Amino acid sequence: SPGIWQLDCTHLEGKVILVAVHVASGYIEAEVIPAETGQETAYFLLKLAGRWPVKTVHTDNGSNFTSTTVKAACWWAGIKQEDGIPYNPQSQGVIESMNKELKKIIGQVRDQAEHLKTAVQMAVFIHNHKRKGYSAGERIVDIIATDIQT
Amino acid sequence: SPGIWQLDCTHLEGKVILVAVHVASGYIEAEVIPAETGQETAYFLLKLAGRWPVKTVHTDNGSNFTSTTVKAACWWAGIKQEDGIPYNPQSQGVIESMNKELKKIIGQVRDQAEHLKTAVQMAVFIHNHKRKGYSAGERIVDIIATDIQ
Numbered sequence: 001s002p003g004i005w006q007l008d009c010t011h012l013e014g015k016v017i018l019v020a021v022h023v024a025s026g027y028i029e030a031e032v033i034p035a036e037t038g039q040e041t042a043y044f045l046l047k048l049a050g051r052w053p054v055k056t057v058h059t060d061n062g063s064n065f066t067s068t069t070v071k072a073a074c075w076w077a078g079i080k081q082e083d084g085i086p087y088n089p090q091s092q093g094v095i096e097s098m099n100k101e102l103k104k105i106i107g108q109v110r111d112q113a114e115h116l117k118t119a120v121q122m123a124v125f126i127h128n129h130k131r132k133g134y135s136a137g138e139r140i141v142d143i144i145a146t147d148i149q150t
Numbered sequence: 151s152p153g154i155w156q157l158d159c160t161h162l163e164g165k166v167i168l169v170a171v172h173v174a175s176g177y178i179e180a181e182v183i184p185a186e187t188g189q190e191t192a193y194f195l196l197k198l199a200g201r202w203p204v205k206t207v208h209t210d211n212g213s214n215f216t217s218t219t220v221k222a223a224c225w226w227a228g229i230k231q232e233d234g235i236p237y238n239p240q241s242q243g244v245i246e247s248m249n250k251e252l253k254k255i256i257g258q259v260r261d262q263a264e265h266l267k268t269a270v271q272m273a274v275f276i277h278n279h280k281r282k283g284y285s286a287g288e289r290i291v292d293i294i295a296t297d298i299q
């Protein structure tokens with residue numbers, strides 16, 4: 001559970017926002033990309049895995065599951081690549097709600113930045129610091145620290 | 151100390167590698183950029199601060215210290231912008247050693263990637279996971295968790 005992440009792809013302003021959610025905490029990382037390709041997804045995963053201990057990634061769709069570049073990145077970074085089939089059906093709804101929330105925050109900050117990528121990073125900041133009580137940022141750190149003492 | 155970061159700028163293949171070091175742990179984040187501008191530095195800081203609890207940043211030079219865009223990012227993200235004057239003189243050497251180490255790792259992986267940015271992210275991964283004994287990645291998490299508790 002401490003090492004499980006979920007990829008998620010949402011759209012805004014004719015661009016793609018690629019999101020990784022740390023399942024146990026709700027902490028996220030995100031980037032704006034022109035289109036969701038294997039190469040973009042692979043590069044995003046490499047960045048993520050150098051920053052947090054990524055053990056398992058539930059890919060967002062079958063194309064990224066299949067992509068040889070994504071498999072190469074997962075091999076390189078020691079990540080177990082899994083599907084994202086919501087065997088637990090509440091997962092689809094949680095992700096959809098998260099996407100709606102992110103789009104809302106982006107809208108609230110959009111005017112403070114010239115570029116969408118900047119607004120998305122502002123939204124990541126706000127999401128991860130939001131007290132809901134601990135923040136997602138506090139939760140991921142706690143969860144991983146607890147795991148290390150084991 | 152748990153919230154203190156140091157910016158660092160090094161060069162390779164006619165490009166710029168911008169690095170943030172978490173001082174207490176030695177954990178790093180890094181990106182390749184065409185040139186070190188206020189705008190690049192500001193954007194990098196926004197990314198960093200949304201991901202880790204950045205309280206204080208020791209800027210890498212006076213231009214980024216002065217940049218109004220960098221100040222805007224630090225204001226926005228709630229970061230205290232400080233200079234990077236090594237009042238403690240061992241700081242220059244530690245950073246220089248880190249840059250050398252990173253360039254070495256980059257060289258070791260360079261052939262596995264078409265693009266420099268990919269090699270740099272591989273080097274970040276290796277640096278943060280390297281057991282010295284705990285890894286830098288384990289140390290940053292421990293330090294911040296202790297601070298929360």
Ligand SMILES: NCCCCCC(=O)N[C@H]1Cc2ccccc2[C@@H]1Cc1ccc2c(c1C(=O)O)OCO2
Binds near residue numbers: 042265269
């Ligand atoms: N020079 C001879 C070797 C060239 C082999 C290229 C090759 O398949 N490496 C993989 C191995 C590997 C392993 C993990 C991550 C990336 C990569 C690379 C793929 C890659 C993917 C996405 C990107 C990239 C590159 C890049 O290649 O940089 O750049 C920006 O987004």
Ligand SMILES: NCCCCCC(=O)N[C@H]1Cc2ccccc2[C@@H]1Cc1ccc2c(c1C(=O)O)OCO2
Binds near residue numbers: 116226
């Ligand atoms: N209604 C439009 C008003 C325009 C205000 C522009 C403005 O100063 N925002 C700051 C506020 C703010 C606060 C923190 C970080 C960035 C920014 C933004 C600066 C910025 C910097 C670097 C970048 C950017 C943009 C960007 O502006 O996206 O893009 C990629 O690298």
